[PDB]
Structure 1
Amino acid sequence: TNLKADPEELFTKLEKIGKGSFGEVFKGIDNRTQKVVAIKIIDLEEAEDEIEDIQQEITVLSQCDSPYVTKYYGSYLKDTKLWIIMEYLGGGSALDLLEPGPLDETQIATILREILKGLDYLHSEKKIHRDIKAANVLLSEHGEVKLADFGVATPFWMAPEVIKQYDSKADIWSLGITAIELARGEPPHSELHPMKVLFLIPKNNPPTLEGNYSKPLKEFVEACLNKEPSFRPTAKELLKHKFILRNAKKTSYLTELIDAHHHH
């Protein structure tokens, strides 16, 4: 973390793009390159007991070099504020893109395929994302799909073994939930109080994808959502799952989904 440079000279802060973990996030401009960046600003006075988790996510992101993981550019300390600079992805989150209407299975498969490419990278690197969900999947304006908002090392996407206090297979369960979310708009139990979901996930049979979806998609979900982690496939194996192979297409096609969200 750069303690000497002034981030307010280096970056032009623009509009908020939502509330993130531990701080507010803004669209911004790198004044030297004119590239758009995402800027998270954390008040270290207000968020004292969480600084350890902040440095941990900074460390993890700095160790990632993948087309499928949002790029980290650095961080700056100015007075009491920590500025964290990331790649700006103009397509929004996958969750955002659900809003105009349902995804088709080509769009679902393409997004899941790219998520799997990111999980394959992280797991090969002995990393766990820990918070796979549609809101943490970001798209570039060209349709590229990247992971963001790693979980710290809300219950709806959590694997049962995580709740009961796991390895990379936890990400595979969360991917199954995310698959349901991309198909249906929300994860299982989304109508229920989170404290109820905390005991339902360990006690109940795993969720299934309900509705008029293709059997390969239902089987993709079922394969991820096995209570037994060792019975879940790896990200590598799921990249060859028939649902992915028969339905995923070029990521550039997702610009149609991005454009639809702007006309909505």
Structure 2
Amino acid sequence: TNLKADPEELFTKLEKIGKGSFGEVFKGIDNRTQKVVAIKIIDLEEAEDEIEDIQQEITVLSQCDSPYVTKYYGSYLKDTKLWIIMEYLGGGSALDLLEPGPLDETQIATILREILKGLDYLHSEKKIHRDIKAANVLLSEHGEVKLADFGVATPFWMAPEVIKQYDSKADIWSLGITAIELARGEPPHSELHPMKVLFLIPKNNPPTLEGNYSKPLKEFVEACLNKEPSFRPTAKELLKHKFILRNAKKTSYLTELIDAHHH
């Protein structure tokens, strides 16, 4: 977290690539290497109790060294603005890639498998992602799949025990919801007011995947979406799930999904 270096000099800020947590995010250029980066700019005068959450997310990202976690390159403070520099992933989010139409089960399994590799990494490091969902899964222009936007230490992807106040198995529930989101376009209860969903997730039976999907995909979802966390499999075990093994293919095939999105 460098305090003398000037980030206007080190980076060229390009177009906004969305609003993230706590500030605007820009495509940018590292002027020394010409590599494309993602730049989040947070106004610290506009942040109340958020500054502690920002620092905690920086710390966690700095401790991750995995091809399945968006890389953190550093941060800078210029007058009142914190610049956070991260790996730029040109494929967009998995949520973005749902827009042209439905994924097939090969694409779903490939994305889930790469998410599981990230979760296996994090849980083996004694970390919890805490916000697994399609919008937080970023793809490189080559089809590599990475996790982003860790949750701080909207309810639709939250495990019931998280809502009732848990461990890494909460990520497995969120993965199940993400599986449904990748199959259907949106999570269970997405039509409902969030405050309704807050009491439905604890109260109701767990969601199931409805529609003409393979039984292994439906069983993948069911295994993740058990109200009892100890009954959920680990990420390691789910990497061997028949749905994953029978359907996932090379990640480079996902470039066809990325091109379809830039139709």
For Structure 1 versus Structure 2, the TM-score category normalised by the shorter chain is over 0.9
Deviation at 1:47, TM superposition (A): 1.0
Instruction: Note the alpha carbon deviations across 1:145-203, whole angstroms, 9 max, x for none.
Output: 00000000000000000000100000000000000000000000000000000000000
Deviations 1:87-107 (A, max 9, x none): 000000000000000000000
Aligned to 1:9: 9
Distance of 2:49 and 2:166 partners within structure 1: 25
Write the distance in 2 (CA, Å) between the matches of 1:41 and 1:220. Answer: 38
CA distance in 2 between counterparts of 1:119 and 1:127 reads: 9
Secondary structure, aligned partner of 1:17: strand
Q: CA deviation at 1:49?
A: 1.4
Classify the secondary structure of the residue corresponding to 2:76: strand
Q: Secondary structure at the match of 1:15?
A: strand
- Provide the C-alpha distance between the structure 1 equivalents of 2:233 and 2:132, rounded to a whole number of angstroms: 16
Unaligned runs of 5+ in 2: none
Counterparts of 1:189 and 1:217, CA distance in 2:
20
In structure 1, C-alpha distance between the alignment counterparts of 2:154 and 2:167, rounded to whole Å: 19
Structure 1 window deviating more from structure 2 (47-56 vs 228-237): it is: 47-56
User: Which secondary structure state, in structure 2, belongs to the residue aligned with residue 16 of structure 1?
Assistant: strand
SS in 2 for 1:178: helix
CA distance in 1, matches of 2:179, 2:225: 10
Task: Provide the C-alpha distance between the structure 1 equivalents of 2:62 and 2:18, rounded to a whole number of angstroms.
Answer: 23
Cα distance in 2 between the residues matched to 1:163 and 1:40:
29
> Aligned with 1:53: secondary structure?
helix
Q: CA deviation at 1:263?
A: 3.8
Q: Secondary structure at the match of 1:101?
A: coil
Distance 1:46 1:126 in 2: 32
**1:80 offset after TM fit, Å?**
0.1
Q: Secondary structure at the match of 2:153?
A: coil
Q: CA deviation at 1:48?
A: 2.3
- TM superposition score normalised by structure 2: 1.00
- Residue 50 of structure 1 and its aligned partner are, at CA, apart by 0.3
Q: Kindly indicate whether residue 258 of structure 2 is the aligned counterpart of residue 250 of structure 1.
A: no
Deviations 1:60-91 (A, max 9, x none): 00000000000000000000000000000000
SS in 2 for 1:48: coil
TM-score, normalised to structure 1's length?
0.99
Asked if 1:200 is matched to 2:191, the reply is no
Is the partner of 2:100 in helix, strand or coil?
A: coil
State the identity %: 100
* CA distance in 1: counterparts of 2:69 and 2:48, whole angstroms: 27
- Check 1:130–1:242 CA distance in 2 against 1; reply closer, same or farther (3 A cut): same
For these two proteins, the number of residue pairs brought into alignment is 263
Match of 2:209 in 1: 209
Give the aligned partner of residue 235 of structure 2. 235
Q: Per-residue displacement from partner, 1:93-144 (whole Å, max 9, x unpaired)?
A: 0000000000000000000000000000000000000000000000000000
Runs of 4+ in 1 over 6 A off after TM superposition: none
